[PDB]
Amino acid sequence: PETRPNHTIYINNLNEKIKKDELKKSLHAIFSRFGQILDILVSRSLKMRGQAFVIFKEVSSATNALRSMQGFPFYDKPMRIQYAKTDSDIIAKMK
RNA sequence: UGGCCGGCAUGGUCCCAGCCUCCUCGCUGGCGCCGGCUGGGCAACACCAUUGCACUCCGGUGGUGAAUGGGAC
Ligand SMILES: [Ba+2]
Ligand SMILES: [Ba+2]
């Protein structure tokens, strides 16, 4: 069953050969236009590699970003996007 | 040589260039032949495995089984 709208968009199918720092930067390069970004979390661990959590301030930003960038060719791969299952702490720490 | 040893071979010291490397990337490192013993680390790099929902850093294996010429005394 799909996920409900969230402040954070979960992206996967990312190019696993990109260093964390760079990846966080690049992502910001293409997602910033959708709205303020509280943070982007990336990990290259066995379980978390190839995915990312972009955390937008306003749910609409994520939503917009979701519908707009779905399937976007990034580092030679089609970016897959969804809403995160739950709220990232940064967001909890408020609403 | 990342630590360690054994065989053999080989006049010496400099100078310039080239080249090499997971473990002090460069001019007060190294760049004959052969065999065996062993430590560290995934930091980089490669390869294998992975499509994975986090907010705790964290899969595995591999490399040195490396690299030549010239010139001054
Ligand atoms: Ba060396
Ligand atoms: Ba690794």
Side-chain angles (χ1 to χ4, degrees), chain A residues 1 3-16 18-94:
Chain A
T3 313
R4 295 295 101 183
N6 204 287
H7 278 94
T8 295
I9 62 155
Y10 162 94
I11 303 166
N12 71 320
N13 183 216
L14 291 169
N15 189 306
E16 297 173 32
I18 274 57
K19 299 193 189 68
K20 178 169 170 197
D21 179 73
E22 188 194 326
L23 181 51
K24 290 175 63 179
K25 300 220 202 300
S26 291
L27 283 158
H28 185 73
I30 65 182
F31 280 113
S32 51
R33 53 130 166 173
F34 290 115
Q36 210 194 320
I37 291 176
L38 298 183
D39 196 13
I40 296 191
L41 277 48
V42 157
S43 180
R44 304 240 290 165
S45 332
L46 176 58
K47 185 187 167 193
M48 293 304 112
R49 71 190 45 181
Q51 315 135 46
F53 288 88
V54 174
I55 308 173
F56 287 102
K57 172 144 193 178
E58 300 187 8
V59 195
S60 59
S61 289
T63 297
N64 246 62
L66 184 31
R67 294 169 200 166
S68 322
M69 308 297 316
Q70 171 64 49
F72 188 80
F74 195 59
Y75 285 114
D76 312 301
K77 288 178 66 64
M79 186 178 283
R80 172 152 59 271
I81 308 167
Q82 315 185 322
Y83 286 113
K85 287 183 171 65
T86 77
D87 289 12
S88 301
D89 297 343
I90 19 296
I91 287 305
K93 299 193 180 301
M94 307 180 83

